[PDB]
Amino acid sequence: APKAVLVGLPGSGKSTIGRRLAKALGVGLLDTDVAIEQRTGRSIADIFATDGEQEFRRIEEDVVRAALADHDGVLSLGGGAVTSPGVRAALAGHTVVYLEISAAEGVRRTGGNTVRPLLAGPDRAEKYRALMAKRAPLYRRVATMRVDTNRNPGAVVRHILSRLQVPS
Ligand SMILES: Nc1ncnc2c1ncn2[C@@H]1O[C@H](COP(=O)(O)OP(=O)(O)O)[C@@H](O)[C@H]1O
Ligand SMILES: O=C(O)C1=C[C@@H](OP(=O)(O)O)[C@@H](O)[C@H](O)C1
Numbered sequence: 120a121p122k123a124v125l126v127g128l129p130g131s132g133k134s135t136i137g138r139r140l141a142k143a144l145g146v147g148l149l150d151t152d153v154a155i156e157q158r159t160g161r162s163i164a165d166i167f168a169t170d171g172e173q174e175f176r177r178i179e180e181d182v183v184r185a186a187l188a189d190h191d192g193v194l195s196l197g198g199g200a201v202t203s204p205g206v207r208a209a210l211a212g213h214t215v216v217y218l219e220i221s222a223a224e225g226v227r228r229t230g231g232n233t234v235r236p237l238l239a240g241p242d243r244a245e246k247y248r249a250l251m252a253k254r255a256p257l258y259r260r261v262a263t264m265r266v267d268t269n270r271n272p273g274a275v276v277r278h279i280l281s282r283l284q285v286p287s
Contacts, residue, residue, distance in 0.1 A: 120187060121194040122146060123283065124210060126201055126258050127218035128251060129238060130228035132268045132275065133195040136218060139276045146192035151200065154182050163197075167236040176203050184209050198250070199237065201257040210261045216279055217262035221269055222248050 122144055125133045134150065141148035152163055155178055159166065166175045180203045186194050187209055200206045220228070226247050229238060238246055259265070264282055268275055 121190055121192060121213065123193050123279070124187070124213050124215045125193065125195040125218060126215060126261060127198065127268070128220060128225055128247075128254065129198045129235060130225040131198075131218040131220040132228075132272065133198075133218060135272050136216075136268070136275055136279070137193050137195040139272055140279055141193040143276060143280055144193065147190070148193050148195065149186055149190045150195045150197075151179065151182050151186055152197045154186060155179060155197075158182065162234075164234045164236055172236075176200075179203070180205050180209075187213065199254075201254060201261055207257065207261050214263055214283065215261050216264045216266055217258045218266050218268045218275075219258075222251055224269055225251070 123140060125137055125140075127133055137148045137150065155166075156163060159178065163175070166178065176199070179197060179200055183196060183200055183203075183206050196206070201210075222244065226244050229235065229243070229247070237250065264279070266275055266279060266282075270278070
């Protein structure tokens, strides 16, 4: 099972922190979005565009569940994976690091030309707020560790490592 599962909104630092945390723990990084792409042979964007969000979530849930069983490193979940009840259920018992970000910094971090089905213009800020407001309690319910990332990646990682190692 994963040493740590990373959850957070897009732009919260999953890929950055994941790479750095993985390195620090001497383990591999798996991103569930990449495994979805690997397994389906299809882009995340095409599944959304053609098949729709709900089929995406079921695929995503299956991939999350397998990864929770087969991956021994740091696992990062796509931002909406916690909207699925069965994903939250499967996360029970795991080490789950919620990377928290404010709207304004998250907006700022997600601004370039990455294709994002649920966060395209115009009005990305509005859309970011709606995703944050809706998902905050969902991230909170699965998290075993809340990490404010609004700090330096290196710092965030030292904090995570520390908190993985010692009693509450
Ligand atoms: N702890 C942090 N503080 C400030 N900026 C960060 C931090 N972690 C990541 N970033 C920045 O946020 C952007 C997106 O980070 P990323 O790791 O791709 O988030 P996610 O993978 O959750 O979408 C990048 O520009 C990255 O440099
Ligand atoms: O917010 C979401 O629901 C999504 C976030 C993406 O993952 P990241 O959070 O890694 O960008 C990806 O799974 C898809 O576009 C849906």
